[PDB]
Structure 1
Amino acid sequence: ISHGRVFRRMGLGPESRIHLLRNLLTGLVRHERIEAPWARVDEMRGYAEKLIDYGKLGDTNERAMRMADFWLTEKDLIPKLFQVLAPRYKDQTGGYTRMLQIPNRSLDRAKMAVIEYKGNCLPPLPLPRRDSHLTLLNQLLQGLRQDLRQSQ
């Protein structure tokens, strides 16, 4: 039974799971894009959310410094995480990253997905563009909204 149980299983235990999560977070902070299975993808996204929150809490804080040092073994990535990814998103609240599913792999045929912070400099991924506003149903809804506005 696993009712209301969060955090899935990955490696040979919680230690290996957190190690893989830290490695993926470091690789993402380095390249800003990684292909991982959907489970690990969402786990890394949820972890990077709190990581960005901590980085935004403050740089002089010792707790945030320790968290960054423990979650970034590359060392050289902590200054970047603190002085590039923190001020750039100083206007947003908690909405960061971007989840997009990859079709399939070539060997094990895994359900991979993409991860990347909003903005950045890498090319933009083909986001799922919704239907245009000049279609039939869209025009009908626009006319209905106009009629409702004219009524009141």
Structure 2
Amino acid sequence: ISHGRVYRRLGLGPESRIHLLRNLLTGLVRHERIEATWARADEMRGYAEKLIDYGKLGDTNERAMRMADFWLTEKDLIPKLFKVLAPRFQGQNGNYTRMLQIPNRKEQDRAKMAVIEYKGNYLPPLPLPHRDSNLTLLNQLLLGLQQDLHHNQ
């Protein structure tokens, strides 16, 4: 009976879970694109989004600095969070991270894998799933339906 609980049980315990997640978050901020097991990447996605919000609060905020200090073990990253990532995501209200499933791991444990990144990074674009064009057969028929309904009141 684990109804309503919003966390995975990871690592050696609750504290170990935080540290495992913290290490992934630290890697994500530095490199902006990280591969982990799909479950662990999903666990860390929420923290990645909330960290940007703390960065938006501002450099001078004391709580933001303490939060940034705890989560970014490599302390050179803290300037990056407040002066690079937060300015980038000023317009958005959320959805800063992009997470997609990668083919399973070829390492005899066949782990389910994911790629987690921050949006807007400098790295080569991921091969995202592109929806079909309006020129396809089904789309054109729907486009015809849309035009008639809009034009005819």
Same fold (TM over 0.5): yes
Deviations 1:32-81 (A, max 9, x none): 11111111111111101111111111110100000000001100000001
State the distance in 2 between where 1:133 and 1:96 align. Answer: 28
- 2:71 aligns to what? 71
Which position in structure 2 is the counterpart of 1:16? 16
Separation in 2, partners of 1:105, 1:26: 22
Structure 1 segments, 4+ long, off by >6 Å, are: none
Gaps of 5+ in 2: none
SS at match of 1:99: strand
1:93 corresponding residue in structure 2 = 93
- The equivalences for 1:2-151 within 5 A come to 2-107=2-107, 108-151=109-152
What is the RMSD of the two structures over their aligned residues, measured on CA atoms?
A: 0.7
Residue 30 of structure 1, CA deviation = 1.0
Per-residue CA distance 1:100-146 (angstroms, 9 max, x = gap): 10111112101110011111100000001011110000000000000
Identity of aligned residues (%): 87
CA distance in 1, matches of 2:92, 2:6: 26
Find the aligned partners of 1:11 and 1:94 in 2 and give their Cα distance.
Answer: 28
Measure the CA separation in 2 of the matches of 1:43 and 1:136: 40
In the TM superposition, what is the alpha-carbon distance from 1:150 to its structure 2 partner? 1.6
- The TM-score, its normalising length taken from structure 2, stands at 0.97
Higher strand share: 2
Which letter maps to 2:47? Y
